[PDB]
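Bench log, entry 3. Co-assembly request; chain sequences pasted below exactly as received.
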Amino acid sequence: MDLKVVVSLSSRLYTDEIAKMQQRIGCILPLASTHGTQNVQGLGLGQVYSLETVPDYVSMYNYLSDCTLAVLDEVSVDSLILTKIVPGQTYAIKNKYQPFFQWHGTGSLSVMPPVFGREHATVKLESNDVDIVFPMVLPTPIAEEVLQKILLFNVYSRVVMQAPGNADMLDVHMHLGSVSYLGHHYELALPEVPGPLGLALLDNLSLYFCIMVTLLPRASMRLVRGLNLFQEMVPDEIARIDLDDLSVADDLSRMRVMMTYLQSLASLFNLGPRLATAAYSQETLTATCWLR
Amino acid sequence: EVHHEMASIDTGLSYSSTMTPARVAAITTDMGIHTQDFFSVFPAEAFGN
Amino acid sequence: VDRRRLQRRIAGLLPPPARRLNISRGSEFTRDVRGLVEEHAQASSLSAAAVWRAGLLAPGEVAVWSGWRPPVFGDFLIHASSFNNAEATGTPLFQFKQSDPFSGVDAVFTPLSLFILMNHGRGGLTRMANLLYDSPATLADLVPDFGRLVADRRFHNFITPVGPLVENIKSTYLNKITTVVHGPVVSKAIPRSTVKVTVPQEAFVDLDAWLSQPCPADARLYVALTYEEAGPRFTFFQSSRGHCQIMNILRIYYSPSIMHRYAVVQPLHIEELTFGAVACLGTFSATDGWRRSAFNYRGSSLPVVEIDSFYSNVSDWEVIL
Amino acid sequence: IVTPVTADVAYFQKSNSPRGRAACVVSCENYNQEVAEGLIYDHSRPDAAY
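Structure output for the full assembly:
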């Protein structure tokens, strides 16, 4: 059985494009289709993480859990010979990513779409108008930590853009710029100015979290009224319940969209395509992972 | 991997091999004055203030 | 483009392993049934015709498709003090994630060795637990802060199962275990023998027997670190369900202990709300599984459940509440 | 090279460097300058001779 996917290039690359791709000969990236010859317009995370549209993590996450993944094998002048991963056998990937998180053997490698700036994980090709975005491969505890912290960074930037007397920049930066795992302390590249009215990455996810935990105290009391005293014992102020003034149609709509946003956010908090490493050798930066 | 196994068993009664230190090459330590501090060997102990 | 070149190449590409053979009589043992039943082994003596006949130089899979993948190993360098070399060849290990950044020597834990972490931070299991590992402080220091990790209930995301051991080469100071982290647990030895996962009996419950319709083909082995009020316990669970069903079954199983933990201590702090975690270790055949036997050390012998023909597949930690 | 009057004679009887410390500058790790100035100028640490 073969695994080669030979994407060819229309106009052949310049020398610096080869030089910037050649340093990333070990990274993985999604593919469009699992066919034995492609072209560069379908490649990894370009058509959703582009400049003209608003970028969103939800659609990128659905695309990443949608299609196949592929480490690349060699970069010639006019081709990118690359092998797709299948869950049958295991592969040799490398931690050649620009926010360098030191891996560990028997680590669960999450593949999330890049939130550390578009310019860090990109190869802006000038030969063909294409911006190959490699996804950021990081181990799952760091992944869930950076997801919680940039959700909190986005809601804390929006709450200081809506009002100055709530949150402080000496408060939300020493607490949220620090990702600590296994003694390794990491610093984060965060947007100090995200810009209002959405228009940026991880905005709607914070909005999804806000509307979900907004409608959730309306749902908890409906469930404990439908289902009890141990479940009324733990909250105290939410036990002031007013379920009899709201219409059943509007309450039904709110309950349904609460369940839907809760589900989508919960499935997103599982990090999608999750590789599982065996023996990470940082002498040669090479981990051995398979599709799990 | 290339796996190999060998079985050796002493056929004499007493010690049938010997190993003597012949010539010093270098005193690779310096016989200095450096005590190990007990604040690193017993680190959790402190005083009342 | 020439047809005669492609035809001979695809004639190497095409013909599959024989998926059926219509036997005329089951005592002839002809060449065809030999070609069906012969399986290529992963070991050979070092010669020319020996590797040319056992076929070690074939790429991808050994031949002179069938779902037989070679397992991926995990080789771990530990002290000789945390791992009793007379422990069984098939026991599931638990590597602790050490806070030291460039460690190089880690901390693994047999569930026999994992008992005294629970019981010296404060039946048949306690006797062999103190017998196989005589000093509880030589493991209570490998985890640096067991009391704080059990205090903030972050002890399951620090422990990753690496599956069962396969070979434990005895060295004097720094010991090299090799476990199978994912795949079919077969022995790496020249007389190739079957290796069974030897889990202690008291640390095991059969959950199919705890309920006491459809008979599936393969059942999964689950472990369950849970934060009791008496310290943690590493209970094993055997079941033939998925993860997403067996977590509900575990919620049913520990629903008394949830009310008991709320009755013994009010979770005034945030971290005292979480309760336990489950993670699968892999699959095995549900019919001939989990026969019992005993394990002989010098001063005692506790009962031990043996699960044979294991397929190791470690899964991640899932909170139960 | 002006030194104080209470330098011990045993330093001046052995093959030393004329300054206060020796320079163990070959002994530190290669291609590094901060640890070299640690092994040259840093007087929070003592020279490993004395």
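Chains A and D do not touch (no CB pair under 8 Å). The longest helix of chain A spans residues 140-162.
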